[PDB]
């Protein structure tokens, strides 16, 4: 019951106040169930960046051990970013159970942390060779890839 109670709190908190352009909501199944353990989210790219105008889908998977353990956050498979695996998994220090996670971190803080990561990748956390290479050795090709991807995710 600890996980459910905390997710119910996060649900209310999110609905009453969240940053503009973001979406975060429990998944509705084809059977009508609404699942507090799996949330579908949308992270806007920041204005004034190559991510601008993109609205990027992300799924947050909580466990019965939340909030002792962090959710798993996934962009779509093949999403282009140096810190995102091919599977879509996002690498973020605060999502790391071994070191950065603390139970008090909110869903809002996670999604803002991911939004920040989009235009400011972490050079120590390379997850995919494609993004990471272009980022490190060919910024012009990287920039073109990012802007093309933003166009794939309009509001």
């Amino acid at each position: 019951g600890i996980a459910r109670g905390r997710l119910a709190e996060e649900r209310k908190s999110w609905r009453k106040n969240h940053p503009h352009g973001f979406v975060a909501k429990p998944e509705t199944g084809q059977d009508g169930t609404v699942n507090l353990m799996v949330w579908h989210c949308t992270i806007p790219g920041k204005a004034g960046t190559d991510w601008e105008g993109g609205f990027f889908p992300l799924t947050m998977h909580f466990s019965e051990d939340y909030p002792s353990k962090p959710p798993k956050c996934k962009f779509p498979q093949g999403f282009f970013h140096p810190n995102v695996y091919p599977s879509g998994t996002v690498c973020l220090s605060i999502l790391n159970e071994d070191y950065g996670w603390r139970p008090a971190i909110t869903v809002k803080q996670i999604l803002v942390g991911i939004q920040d990561l989009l235009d400011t990748p972490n050079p120590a956390d390379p997850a995919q060779t494609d993004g990471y290479h272009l980022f490190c050795q060919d910024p012009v090709e990287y920039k073109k890839r990012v802007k093309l991807q933003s166009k794939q995710y309009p509001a």
Binding site: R4, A8, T28, G29, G32, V34, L36
Partner: protein
């Protein structure tokens, strides 16, 4: 922990929301949960797919909700704005007195 006696096969989610949650518990923006699943939410912030699904749930018998409410089910009810929060123990009952229990259900443990 309140006790709700109710015919789970014949009463609809709507009956519980209107007669218990809104009327007796005084919750105007309720979130109703059964385990990890949300059975109902209300508000102008919900997207049209979620509202359409919640609208469909209102018209379902309790025992036929996507997460079925049966004898011994425990519901959790929270309100979006007010600090009110309740657990409700559901006890199935077949029949109710037509003039003493005219709402077709009985809430015990409530002030």
């Amino acid at each position: 922990p309140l006790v709700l006696e109710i015919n789970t096969r014949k009463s609809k989610l709507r009956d519980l929301v209107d007669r218990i949650v809104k009327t007796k518990l005084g919750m105007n923006l309720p979130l109703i949960m059964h385990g990890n699943s949300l059975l109902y939410e209300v508000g102008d912030d919900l997207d049209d797919i979620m509202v359409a699904n919640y609208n469909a749930n209102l018209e379902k018998y309790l025992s036929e909700l996507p997460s079925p409410i049966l004898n011994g089910s425990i519901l959790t009810v929270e309100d979006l704005q007010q600090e009110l929060s309740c657990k409700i123990n559901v006890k199935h009952r077949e029949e109710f007195d037509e003039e003493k229990e005219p709402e077709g259900m009985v809430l015990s443990g409530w002030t």
